[model samples]
Target: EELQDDYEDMMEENLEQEEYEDPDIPESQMEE
Candidate 1:
């Protein structure tokens, strides 16, 4: 259970990083 929690946390971090790096879309579109 602990390992699963850690994996989800890492995945969330990676997704946030990817969103931060994405540049094609406008910030307004992302908010929708």
Candidate 2:
């Protein structure tokens, strides 16, 4: 489950990366 969860965490952070690029708003990914 650790490896499974590792990729899952990457998936979440990947979404955040887009929001982070904005820097103004998070695109609500964190809010998502």
Candidate 3:
């Protein structure tokens, strides 16, 4: 649940940014 929460928060932060990139979400995190 914590991981999901972090992912969701990251998604929101990515949306807020102008020049978002893949590195914003680490590959290790995506594995989840």
**Candidate 2 per-residue lDDT over residues 1-32, each given as its tens digit:** 44654687777875776665645743556653
TM-score of 3: 0.30
lDDT (10s digit) by residue, model 1, range 1-32? 44654687777875786666656755566555
Candidate 3 C-alpha lDDT tens digits along 1-32: 44654587778875776666454654566555
TM-score of each: 0.32, 0.29, 0.30
- lDDT minimum window of 10 residues, candidate 3: 21-30
Name the better of 1 and 3 by TM-score: 1
TM-score: the better of candidates 1 and 2: 1
Model 1 has an lDDT value of: 0.66
Give candidates' CA RMSD values in order.
Answer: 7.1, 9.9, 13.0
RMSD of candidate 3 to the truth, in angstroms, is 13.0
In angstroms, the error of model 2 at 10 is 0.4
